[PDB]
Amino acid sequence: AGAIREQLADLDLRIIIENSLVEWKQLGEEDRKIVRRKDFLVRRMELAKHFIRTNIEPEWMVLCLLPVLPPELRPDI
Amino acid sequence: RRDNQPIPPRAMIMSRKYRTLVSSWIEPLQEEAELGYEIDYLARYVEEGGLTGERKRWVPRRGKTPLDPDAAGFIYSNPIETSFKQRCLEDWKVHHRKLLRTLQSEESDYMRVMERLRNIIVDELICRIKLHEGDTEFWKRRFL
Amino acid sequence: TPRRWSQEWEVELAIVLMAKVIELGGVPTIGDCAVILRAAIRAPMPSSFLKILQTTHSLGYAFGSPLYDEIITLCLDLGELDAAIAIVADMETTGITVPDQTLDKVISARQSNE
Amino acid sequence: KMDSPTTTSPDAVLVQSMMAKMLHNGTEALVMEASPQELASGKCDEVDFDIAVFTNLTREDSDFRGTDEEYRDAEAKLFARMVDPERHRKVVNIDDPNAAFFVQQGNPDVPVVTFAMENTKADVHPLKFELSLFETQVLVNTPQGILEISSGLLGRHNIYNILAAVAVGIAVGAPLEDIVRGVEEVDAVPGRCELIDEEQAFGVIVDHANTPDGLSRLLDSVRELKPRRIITVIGCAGENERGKRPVMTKIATEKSDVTMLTSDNPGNEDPLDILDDMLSGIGWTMQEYLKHGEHDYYPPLSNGHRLFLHDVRRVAVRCAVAMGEEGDMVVVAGKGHESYQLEGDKKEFYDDREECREALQYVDELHQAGIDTSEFPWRLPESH
Numbered sequence: 025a026g027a028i029r030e031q032l033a034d035l036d037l038r039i040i041i042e043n044s045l046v047e048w049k050q051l052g053e054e055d056r057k058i059v060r061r062k063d064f065l066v067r068r069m070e071l072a073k074h075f076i077r078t079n080i081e082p083e084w085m086v087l088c089l090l091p092v093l094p095p096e097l098r099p100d101i
Numbered sequence: 102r103r104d105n106q107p108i109p110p111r112a113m114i115m116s117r118k119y120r121t122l123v124s125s126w127i128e129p130l131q132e133e134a135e136l137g138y139e140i141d142y143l144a145r146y147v148e149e150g151g152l153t154g155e156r157k158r159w160v161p162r163r164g165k166t167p168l169d170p171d172a173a174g175f176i177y178s179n180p181i182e183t184s185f186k187q188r189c190l191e192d193w194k195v196h197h198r199k200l201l202r203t204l205q206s207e208e209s210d211y212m213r214v215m216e217r218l219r220n221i222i223v224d225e226l227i228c229r230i231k232l233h234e235g236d237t238e239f240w241k242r243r244f245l
Numbered sequence: 246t247p248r249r250w251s252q253e254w255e256v257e258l259a260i261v262l263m264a265k266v267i268e269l270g271g272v273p274t275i276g277d278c279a280v281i282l283r284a285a286i287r288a289p290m291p292s293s294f295l296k297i298l299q300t301t302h303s304l305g306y307a308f309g310s311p312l313y314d315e316i317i318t319l320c321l322d323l324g325e326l327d328a329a330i331a332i333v334a335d336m337e338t339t340g341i342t343v344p345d346q347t348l349d350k351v352i353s354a355r356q357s358n359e
Numbered sequence: 360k361m362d363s364p365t366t367t368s369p370d371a372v373l374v375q376s377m378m379a380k381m382l383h384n385g386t387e388a389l390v391m392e393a394s395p396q397e398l399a400s401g402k403c404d405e406v407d408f409d410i411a412v413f414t415n416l417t418r419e420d421s422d423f424r425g426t427d428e429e430y431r432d433a434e435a436k437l438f439a440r441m442v443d444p445e446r447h448r449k450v451v452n453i454d455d456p457n458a459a460f461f462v463q464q465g466n467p468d469v470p471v472v473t474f475a476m477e478n479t480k481a482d483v484h485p486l487k488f489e490l491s492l493f494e495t496q497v498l499v500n501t502p503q504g505i506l507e508i509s510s511g512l513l514g515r516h517n518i519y520n521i522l523a524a525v526a527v528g529i530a531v532g533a534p535l536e537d538i539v540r541g542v543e544e545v546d547a548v549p550g551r552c553e554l555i556d557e558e559q560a561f562g563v564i565v566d567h568a569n570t571p572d573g574l575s576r577l578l579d580s581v582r583e584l585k586p587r588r589i590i591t592v593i594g595c596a597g598e599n600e601r602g603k604r605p606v607m608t609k610i611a612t613e614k615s616d617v618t619m620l621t622s623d624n625p626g627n628e629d630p631l632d633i634l635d636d637m638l639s640g641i642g643w644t645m646q647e648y649l650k651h652g653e654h655d656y657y658p659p660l661s662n663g664h665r666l667f668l669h670d671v672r673r674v675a676v677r678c679a680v681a682m683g684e685e686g687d688m689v690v691v692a693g694k695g696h697e698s699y700q701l702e703g704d705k706k707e708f709y710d711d712r713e714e715c716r717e718a719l720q721y722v723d724e725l726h727q728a729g730i731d732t733s734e735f736p737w738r739l740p741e742s743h
Contacts, residue, residue, distance in 0.1 A: 033163050036161075041177060041178075076176075102269060107270035108271045119274050122266075123274075123277040124281050129280075133279075134276055134282070135279060135283065136275065136276070137309020137311045137312030142639060142640050142642055146604075146639050146640065151602070156636065160631045160644075160645040185255055189248070189249065193247050
C-alpha cells in the first residue's frame with residue numbers, strides 16, 4: 025500500500041483533467057466499451073476537480089495512523 | 102485603448118522560452134527562435150535572481166499548487182496551450198459538424214454532399230445549407 | 246463559415262497585435278520579435294520584413310548578423326530586391342555593422358537587374 | 360600520518376607546533392606548501408626556508424582578497440628571503456612570463472636552477488614525453504645528464520611538477536638514481552588528478568576542481584591524453600557560490616562527451632534546487648528533465664553530448680564508472696581528497712575514492728547479469 029500512497033501523493037491533478045478531456049474528445053470523434061470508457065474519464069476528471077478546490081489530499085486514502093475508538097464505546101471491535 | 106487602460110504586467114507575463122502573448126500562438130510552441138546568435142543563459146540566470154536565492158526554480162513538488170505562474174488566478178489552472186492554427190482548424194471542423202447534423206434532420210447529390218462533409222471532418226451544394234443558431238424568431242415559426 | 250488559417254493571415258495579425266501592445270505600454274521580448282520574424286521567413290511575404298525590423302529596432306533590439314544575412318538571401322531567392330534594398334537601407338541608418346558578403350551579393354544583384 | 364585539523368590554511372601557531380613535533384621525532388628535512396594566502400597573512404613569516412621553488416602564476420583563486428600585483432608580491436615574499444648564497448637555492452619555471460620577477464627577488468648571488476617544458480634554454484627540460492590514460496614517460500635533460508622517468512601521474516601539467524622535483528634534486532646535488540626512484544615512487548597525491556587504478560580499460564581520476572576555471576583546465580588536460588570519451592561527474596555546493604552553477608554546467612557540457620550532474624555539498628539547500636540552477640546554464644529545467652525520464656529517453660544536447668542527472672552522489676559516481684568503456688576517462692571532480700558529504704548540518708563520512716574503487720570491483724557482475732549500463736536509463740533484461 026505504500027507504493028500506492030507514493031502514486032497518490034505524486035499525482036498532478038491538473039494533468040489528469042487535461043489528459044482525460046483530450047482522450048474523451050478523441051473517442052467522440054470515432055460500442056459498449058467506448059461508452060464505458062467515456063464514463064470512466066468523466067468520473068476521473070470530476071474526482072480530480074474536487075481535490076483541487078478542497079483541502080482533502082488524495083494520499084489520505086492510504087492510512088498511516090489508525091484512530092482508536094474511545095473505550096466507553098467499546099465496553100468484537 | 103479607448104478606455105486609456107494600459108496592459109497590466111500580469112497580462113505580459115513571460116514564459117520559460119522568453120515569449121509573451123505577442124508571440125506564443127505561432128506554432129513552434131514552447132520553443133525559442135534563432136536570434137542569429139547563441140543565447141546567453143548566464144545573463145538570464147543573473148537577471149532572474151540567481152545570485153541571491155530569489156530565482157524561480159522549475160522543480161516539481163508534491164502539493165496542489167501549480168508550478169506555472171500563469172496558472173495563478175484560475176480556479177483549475179489556465180487553459181491548455183492551443184495555437185492559432187489549431188484553433189482555426191477546430192473552428193473549421195465544428196461548423197461542418199453542425200452542417201452534417203442539420204443535413205441529417207431533413208438524390209445522388211445528397212449522397213455526395215454526405216460523403217464530402219464526413220471527408221472534411223459539391224462544396225457549392227454544401228454552401229446552401231443554412232444554420233439558424235440563436236435565431237429565436239425562426240425557431241418560433243417552426244414551433245408553430 | 247469560419248475563415249481558414251493561412252500563414253499570411255497569422256503574420257498580419259501578429260504585426261497588428263505587436264503594434265497594439267507597444268502602444269498600450271507593453272514590451273515584447275527579443276524572442277517574440279524573432280518568432281514573428283521567423284514565421285514570415287517560412288511564409289514568404291517579403292513586404293512585412295521592413296515593418297518587423299522597424300518595430301524590433303524601435304524597442305532597442307539587434308538581431309545577429311546571420312539573421313540579417315538570412316532575410317537578405319531570402320529576398321534574393323524570391324527576387325524581392327525592393328525589400329532587400331530597403332532592409333539594407335534601414336540597417337545603415339541604425340548603424341549596425343553589415344557583413345561584407347551581404348553587401349557584395351546585394352550589389353551584384355543590383356548590377357544584374359539593371 | 361598526522362591527524363591534521365580540517366583547516367585549509369593552518370595558522371602560524373599550528374605550523375610552529377607541528378614543526379617541532381617532527382624535530383622531536385627525528386625529522387631532518389621538510390617540504391611545506393607556501394600558498395599566497397598564507398604568505399600574505401604572515402602565518403609562515405617565522406619559517407626559516409632553505410630552498411624556494413616557484414611553479415607558475417595564473418589568476419585562478421577567487422578567494423584571494425587582493426589585486427594581481429598583490430597576489431604576485433605575496434608569493435615573492437618566499438623568494439625575498441633567498442639571502443644566503445651558500446645555504447639557499449632557487450628553482451624557477453621560466454615558461455611563466457613572471458619568472459624574471461622572482462629571479463630578481465632576494466640575493467642575486469643565490470644559485471638558480473631553471474626548469475621548463477617548452478623553453479629549451481632551461482637547465483632541466485624534457486627531450487621527449489609520451490602521455491596515456493595510465494602513465495606518463497618522460498626523458499629529461501639535466502645539467503648532470505639525462506634521466507628516464509615513468510610516472511603514474513597524468514597530464515602535461517604534472518611534467519612540470521616532475522621537472523621541479525628533478526631541479527630541486529639537481530639543486531641539492533642529489534644522485535640521479537635517487538631522482539628517478541623518488542619521482543617514480545609517488546603514484547597518487549590525494550585529490551590531485553588522482554588515478555584510481557583497479558586493472559581496467561578506462562582511466563578514473565578524482566580531482567578537487569570545484570570552480571569554472573579549475574574544471575576548464577582539468578578537462579583540457581584530460582582531452583590531451585586522447586581518450587575516446589570523457590565522462591564528468593560534477594556538482595555545486597549549497598547556500599554558497601550561486602554564480603558558478605550555470606557556468607560549470609556549460610563548461611562540462613562543452614568539453615565532456617557525457618556529463619553527470621549530482622550533489623556536492625547541499626547543506627540546508629534542497630539538492631534538486633541546486634541542480635535546477637545548474638541546468639539553467641544550458642537552457643533546461645528539472646521539470647523538462649523529469650519529463651524525459653517518463654518517456655524513458657533523454658535526448659542529447661545541441662552539440663551531440665549527453666547530460667544525465669541524479670541527486671545522490673553515491674549513485675551518480677558509480678553509475679558514471681559503469682558507463683566507462685575501453686579507452687575512456689571518468690572524471691569525478693568537486694571533492695577530491697575531502698571525506699565528508701554535508702547534508703543538512705551533519706557531515707556524513709563520504710570518500711569519492713572509495714566509491715570509485717568499490718564500483719570498479721563490482722562492475723563485472725553487473726554486466727554479466729544482462730544489465731545494459733551504456734547510458735540512462737539502464738536496460739535490465741526484464742525490461743522492454
